[PDB]
Amino acid sequence: SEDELYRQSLEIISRYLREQATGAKDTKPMGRSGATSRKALETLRRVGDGVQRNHETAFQGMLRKLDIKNEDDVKSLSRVMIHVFSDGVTNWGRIVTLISFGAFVAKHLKTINQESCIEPLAESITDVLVRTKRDWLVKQRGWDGFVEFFH
Numbered sequence: 001s002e003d004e005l006y007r008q009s010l011e012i013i014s015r016y017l018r019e020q021a022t023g024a025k026d027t028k029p030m031g032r033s034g035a036t037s038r039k040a041l042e043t044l045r046r047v048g049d050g051v052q053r054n055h056e057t058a059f060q061g062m063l064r065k066l067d068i069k070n071e072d073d074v075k076s077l078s079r080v081m082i083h084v085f086s087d088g089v090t091n092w093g094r095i096v097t098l099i100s101f102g103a104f105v106a107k108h109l110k111t112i113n114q115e116s117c118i119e120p121l122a123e124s125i126t127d128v129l130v131r132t133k134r135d136w137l138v139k140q141r142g143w144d145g146f147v148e149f150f151h
């Protein structure tokens with residue numbers, strides 16, 4: 001390991017997706033740069049909840065199209081994130097939509113009683129995000145850049 005950016009990203013995304021699914025704020029330290037991952041998570045809650053709320057109908061229609069039922073559909077969803085998220089313009093706007101739709105999908109995984117697929121979903125999203133937009137993420141100062149961008 002010793003990929004700080006991947007570790008920090010996976011943590012923030014797992015916390016958001018897990019707490020959206022279940023309602024509970026997970027109380028367990030944070031990790032390295034914990035004040036930058038707690039301010040990132042705070043921001044993500046504000047802006048991410050906003051995107052799910054404002055574009056609920058769009059999110060519902062996309063979820064319906066993907067027809068997600070098991071670990072096999074979540075594993076596949078990865079090829080879908082590469083086509084849609086990676087093959088686009090790069091900005092925090094689309095990065096939030098990716099993690100917000102992931103949270104929307106994580107809520108659906110809980111309701112269809114497949115909540116063991118949440119942590120893998122979070123890993124899939126972090127994989128596509130960090131190992132297709134690494135160059136851009138580094139240039140923007142990673143999650144310090146994100147928190148700054150949503151002042």
Ligand SMILES: CC#CCn1c(CC)c(-c2cccc(Cl)c2C)c2c(N[C@H](Cc3ccccc3)C(=O)O)ncnc21
Nearest residue numbers: 055058059062080081084085094095097098101102125
């Ligand atoms: C988990 C995951 C994932 C991948 N992903 C997906 C899922 C395939 C979409 C997407 C594409 C079309 C419609 C909808 Cl509702 C969505 C969510 C997406 C995305 N969408 C925005 C457009 C948009 C913004 C806000 C609300 C609805 C739609 C875009 O393409 O610029 N941006 C980034 N990643 C996206």
